[PDB]
Amino acid sequence: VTPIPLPKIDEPEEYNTNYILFWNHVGLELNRVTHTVGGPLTGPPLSARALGMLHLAIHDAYFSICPPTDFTTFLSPDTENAAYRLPSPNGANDARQAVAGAALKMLSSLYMKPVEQPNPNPGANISDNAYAQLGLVLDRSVLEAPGGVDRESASFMFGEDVADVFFALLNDPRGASQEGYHPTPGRYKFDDEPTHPVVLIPVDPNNPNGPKMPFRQYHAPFYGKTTKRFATQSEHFLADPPGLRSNADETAEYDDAVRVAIAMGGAQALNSTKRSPWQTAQGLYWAYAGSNLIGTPPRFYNQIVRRIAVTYKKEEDLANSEVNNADFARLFALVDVACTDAGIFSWKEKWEFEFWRPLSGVRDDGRPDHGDPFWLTLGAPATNTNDIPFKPPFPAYPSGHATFGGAVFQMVRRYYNGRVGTWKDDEPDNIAIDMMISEELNGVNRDLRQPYDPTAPIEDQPGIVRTRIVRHFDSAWELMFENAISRIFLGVHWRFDAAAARDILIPTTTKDVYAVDNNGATVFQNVEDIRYTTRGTREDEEGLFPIGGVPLGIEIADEIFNNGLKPTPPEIQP
Numbered sequence: 367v368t369p370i371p372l373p374k375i376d377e378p379e380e381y382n383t384n385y386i387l388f389w390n391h392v393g394l395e396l397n398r399v400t401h402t403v404g405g406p407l408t409g410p411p412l413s414a415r416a417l418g419m420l421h422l423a424i425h426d427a428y429f430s431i432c433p434p435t436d437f438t439t440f441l442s443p444d445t446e447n448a449a450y451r452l453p454s455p456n457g458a459n460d461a462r463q464a465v466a467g468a469a470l471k472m473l474s475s476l477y478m479k480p481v482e483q484p485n486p487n488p489g490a491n492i493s494d495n496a497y498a499q500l501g502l503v504l505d506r507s508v509l510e511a512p513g514g515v516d517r518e519s520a521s522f523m524f525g526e527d528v529a530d531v532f533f534a535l536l537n538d539p540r541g542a543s544q545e546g547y548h549p550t551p552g553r554y555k556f557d558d559e560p561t562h563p564v565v566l567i568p569v570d571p572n573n574p575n576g577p578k579m580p581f582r583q584y585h586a587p588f589y590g591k592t593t594k595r596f597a598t599q600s601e602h603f604l605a606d607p608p609g610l611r612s613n614a615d616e617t618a619e620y621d622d623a624v625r626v627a628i629a630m631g632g633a634q635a636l637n638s639t640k641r642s643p644w645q646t647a648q649g650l651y652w653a654y655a656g657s658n659l660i661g662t663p664p665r666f667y668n669q670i671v672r673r674i675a676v677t678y679k680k681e682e683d684l685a686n687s688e689v690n691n692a693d694f695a696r697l698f699a700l701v702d703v704a705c706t707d708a709g710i711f712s713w714k715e716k717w718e719f720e721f722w723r724p725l726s727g728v729r730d731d732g733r734p735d736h737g738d739p740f741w742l743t744l745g746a747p748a749t750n751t752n753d754i755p756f757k758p759p760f761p762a763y764p765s766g767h768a769t770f771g772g773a774v775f776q777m778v779r780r781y782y783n784g785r786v787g788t789w790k791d792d793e794p795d796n797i798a799i800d801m802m803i804s805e806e807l808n809g810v811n812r813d814l815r816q817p818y819d820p821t822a823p824i825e826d827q828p829g830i831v832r833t834r835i836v837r838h839f840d841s842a843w844e845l846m847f848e849n850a851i852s853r854i855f856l857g858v859h860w861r862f863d864a865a866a867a868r869d870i871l872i873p874t875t876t877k878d879v880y881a882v883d884n885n886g887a888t889v890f891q892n893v894e895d896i897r898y899t900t901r902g903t904r905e906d907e908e909g910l911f912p913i914g915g916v917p918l919g920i921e922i923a924d925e926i927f928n929n930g931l932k933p934t935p936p937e938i939q940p
């Protein structure tokens with residue numbers, strides 16, 4: 367099997383001298399490779415789950431051997447419930463090997479061929495080449511691991527056992543099943559994307575050039591309501607989106623949202639598009655649309671967190687510093703677990719409301735003076751490919767990116783408060799980062815003129831190269847904000863999918879109608895002045911709930927952090 371030539375990562379090579387970071391890196395490599403070959407754990411929610419599982423196993427393997435003082439392990443060795451009982455070291459005192467065994471076992475269980483029955487139905491769609499490519503990554507990581515991997519050591523074996531417990535407990539084999547689901551057409555209702563209503567998939571994944579069959583995909587419609595949560599201590603809910611249920615009367619907000627959607631998220635050459643070149647860059651920067659050699663958003667968030675971690679480490683030595691090892695092991699567990707749970711609840715709410723995407727909303731609006739039956743969005747970039755590929759669609763409210771970002775960055779804020787600076791938990795921080803490059807705009811990746819060739823490095827394939835943009839951010843508050851609004855710039859999310867329009871836009875004299883500049887472009891509030899305070903109602907529940915993905919993510923992160931990273935009580939699991 368010819369190894370897929372992977373493009374160089376924009377990050378100091380010193381990072382991987384630290385074994386916690388190295389293993390995180392391997393998880394990210396598998397993330398981008400699986401999205402290049404169509405292997406297991408694709409898509410936003412499941413790819414996040416994989417990283418959450420990986421870091422939970424690493425967390426407990428390390429902290430069992432080098433026990434912490436201000437917190438404990440996720441699972442305990444004295445648990446009565448066998449499923450939640452952590453293995454005991456019993457002599458194993460090599461943390462490096464414990465982490466290695468944990469990481470290797472977990473990733474192998476996650477990405478290697480589920481020969482044990484699961485191959486049928488569940489895995490019945492993944493080619494042997496996909497597994498082969500993923501195996502190569504795993505195989506060389508063992509040889510690339512700093513300090514080597516001693517598979518014979520007791521510590522390595524302990525790590526393996528830790529992984530087994532977590533895999534058995536949290537793996538969700540049928541997480542992406544769509545069996546039984548079908549859209550329910552109507553105003554505000556999610557249905558097949560008008561630009562990609564059907565896909566022609568090969569009857570045999572091992573013969574991609576053989577007979578195809580028409581298929582209609584929906585991304586994980588039952589996952590959110592059935593899957594096991596990681597560390598959340600309760601169920602989270604969002605207000606009804608404008609136009610539905612208790613907020614069906616919020617028509618002014620909806621109408622203005624349609625207006626903003628057209629102006630800010632339309633295709634580049636449309637006369638109605640008012641989005642600026644810089645805003646277009648902001649939209650693509652956070653994309654990570656599950657593309658070839660790129661992967662999904664959870665990968666980018668980890669790339670960013672890696673930089674933050676190293677920039678604010680307590681000790682200079684990246685290779686042999688237990689202070690750094692513990693710090694990184696704890697940070698990533700917190701972040702990736704928050705990311706996992708964020709994916710669960712955003713998906714749960716997405717399929718609960720089944721709110722339609724701006725593309726369908728604008729086209730099917732029906733009012734001659736409001737809609738545009740021929741509107742086109744800038745859309746999620748089809749990076750490293752020569753066309754606009756069909757990707758399993760999912761409802762709009764709330765934004766997955768917004769929820770992931772809210773959770774990941776609020777967690778980082780809670781973790782570094784009082785260490786990098788001091789701030790109120792709900793106000794802007796000072797966790798700044800420099801030289802942050804997105805693979806969507808790195809001067810290497812591109813929009814190909816012909817089909818992607820996995821036997822040749824991206825640089826040798828003709829196409830339009832993405833402009834290299836090196837960014838600097840002043841705070842995790844900014845990262846959180848921009849990550850959310852980037853979806854408005856692409857035209858894939860409504861303004862309320864991110865947060866309440868009242869909390870992010872500049873108001874006018876007319877309620878629910880917001881300010882636009884000279885050229886008609888929407889004006890946003892300054893990041894420093896943004897507070898996610900506006901809540902709304904739910905038809906099915908009493909009280910005020912958060913609006914949009916960002917607020918939802920913040921809440922999930924605060925809850926997990928406040929409880930010190932504790933398992934979801936089994937009694938409240940679905």
Ligand code: VO4
Pocket residue numbers: 410762764765766767768853858859
């Ligand atoms: O991943 V969205 O749900 O922000 O398109």
